[PDB]
């Protein structure tokens, strides 16, 4: 059984209590940033808010799956309503939008909407020039690993990168 | 592999050329409606509209997924911008979230929102309940194979009704 | 004095308490679905936090056409932000218009707009074709006695069927 | 037969060519204001760009009558969209809610949201209490005789000061 | 320092406490209008809503700039969803934009956009021609002193008004 | 005289042609970015449909400004449909709400939301405290020097930084 949220789950892990990020940012769940502040009483104040209980820092696996779709549906909605990101996304195959939406919920709909060329190749279904042209990013700079399962699934249209 | 498209691919057929749906309306793809009209010619006229070309009532695989994607792009848009939607669908699993969306893609997401029992039982995780409400429902005669697949994967929160 | 509601009234008919409708789904006043659900429960909650008091299934006429009106804002607001039925709408009359009103009222707003022919004919006035064009509908099927009278006002352009 | 297009019709009046308003600008059709810009030319711009033609300050009934739906339709979507209004209209009969319409249309929906008290009354179904403290506005002042007929509608709740 | 602030604040005044301003309407802060309501007691209402306290009548500068700026927000998304007037706006200098945004502060986006001719000088930088028929308005009628100031502003492209 | 626009003229520089921002990302005008692909002739594409027309990688003074306006229109409106921003955003003075947009027209309103406590402390006027936890920020680290200006506006509520 393969989706996003197994995608995710394993690209950016599912912790549950508060822990910091690789840029020390407060974090929880699924890749929930929840302050850029260094102050874990702020992250947990966040959290509180999030979850609408008093958490202290700890959430259940149901919560971190909310807190995870709240997160995707903001991606997808990112998505939906960038006009050089929608055209894209609807001419790929359920298995390569979900490496989309992976992307969006890494570095936001701008960031991901910047790759101009490698955005076209996709459209036009040319996968291998796509991977090499997304392989000379910052993106697959900070993060080489996470980025070659993303690339691999876009390069080959299914789960390989994650089975 | 099972997602949304697999799912929806069996319940609402894959045609590559106009026909005829339950209610004498012209449809082609993934149940994807052209018009009410009873006239081939305003079905062509919307299909060519549509994909972008003359069609002549005969499409391709990736114009029927492109299509498709349009249409389910509208159902999350549904979901996610109807307040009584939004919290229920947040709190699905992945799988249990796919069938949510199914409901929507096949009677738009006032009349899912409807269900209003049926809507908090999966909210408070009660799929059993849910799944008894669900099926005395007119969705449910008028359609009762599909809806037992869709509330056999709300009640087990599995793909198990379709692979 | 004939106008959407009068009009609406005497199509969806007006009950002071909650009932099922064609399909068994919980109703009341003008039409107004108030759940799918088969709980009478779940409809005098839903019933309470609309009318915002403790109505036990119960309301009152100008309770009814308040929500008479919720409803209608909400059939209008389909029509002035569907691309393919506001320039229709904004081509007819005061009368046609409540007609097409009545429709999106009856089906929504993606409903109605699938009528994709008898659309252009009505926002060209071609309305005898427009006639025929939704009396082959599953709409006119479903329902024979009302698209009989909301396409004639289509046909006609007055009150005539009311 | 009453309704808000011949209600408007007699206050603001139908004229087919050009004309200057109250104000000296520059109207047509029922009270469509074109422009402030004392510039003729400036006026048959923006009714060329209105019609979707070369209309050299003349129109149709028809191509009026579009214009005056259009004009409704802002009015009606600026109540629908002010927290101020809805609920007051919402709150009125199909006759009343003309009459609210008729003074949006008038003065936009900002104008009509500053009779703070009247727009209360008239919630609270106490007719004639809105009507003197509507005839306490510069509204009734600046255009006396179509506010009494207005103002007349919201008291009885009929089409009498226009039958 | 100059800014849309510190220019509405000269063109508007700020008041601490509700007062009537050129039209008999209860007003207070910067050029906030409560209530066309004849009523003081309306008008405490709305400002004891728009503060979220009981001010009886009297807020503080921080209260005054806070309803400021939601006016002024409210203006430049005015500007940003009329189609009429973005690329206007879109064209202007940051001095020549608070111009813009001033008028639509005073009498709101409709009202402004209905400058047909004045705005599109604008938009091609013939500032001494937008000035001279911006003063033909009933808008400089009606209020000269305020009027010249910010047409200057859209002639000069400077403070200097200020 | 200063304002949003010759204050961020200095930080994001002002140029007429292209070049390649800090991180080699194709730029122009006010720190205007192109496209995240390292293609000049995407980037040149983009600019030619920005400004709509043959450019070749070149515009004008004014042409710059226009993009300008438009970004900054993106900023705000970002902030305005923030719920976390916009209050902060209007409890500050006309200086400091510039020195916000300035943030978020760096590094786009979700990254400014993230600063859960700078925010705050930013809202109950205690500058001091919200200019030292600002530069305990990763974006004070990259950008020292911007930083420093933009915290020192926080701080003193004047243009001093760029004066
Ligand atoms: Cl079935
Ligand atoms: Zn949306
Ligand atoms: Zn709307
Ligand atoms: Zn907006």
């Known amino acids: 059984p393969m989706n996003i949220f197994e995608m995710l789950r394993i690209d950016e892990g599912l912790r549950l209590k508060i822990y910091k990020d690789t840029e020390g940012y407060y974090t929880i769940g699924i890749g929930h940033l929840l302050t850029k502040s260094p102050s874990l009483n702020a992250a947990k104040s966040e959290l509180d808010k999030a979850i609408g209980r008093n958490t202290n820092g700890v959430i259940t696996k149901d919560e971190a799956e909310k807190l995870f779709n709240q ?12 006009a050089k990101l929608k055209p894209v996304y609807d001419s790929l195959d359920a298995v390569r939008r979900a490496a989309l939406i992976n992307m969006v919920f890494q570095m936001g709909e701008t960031g991901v909407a910047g790759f101009t060329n490698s955005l076209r190749m996709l459209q036009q279904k040319r996968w291998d020039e796509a991977a090499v042209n997304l392989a000379k990013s910052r993106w697959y700079n900070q993060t080489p690993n996470r980025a070659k399962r993303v690339i691999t699934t876009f390069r080959t249209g299914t789960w390989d990168a994650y089975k």
Chains 1, 2, 4, 6 share one sequence.
């Open 71 to 82: 997160d995707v549906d903001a991606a997808v909605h990112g998505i939906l309503h960038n």
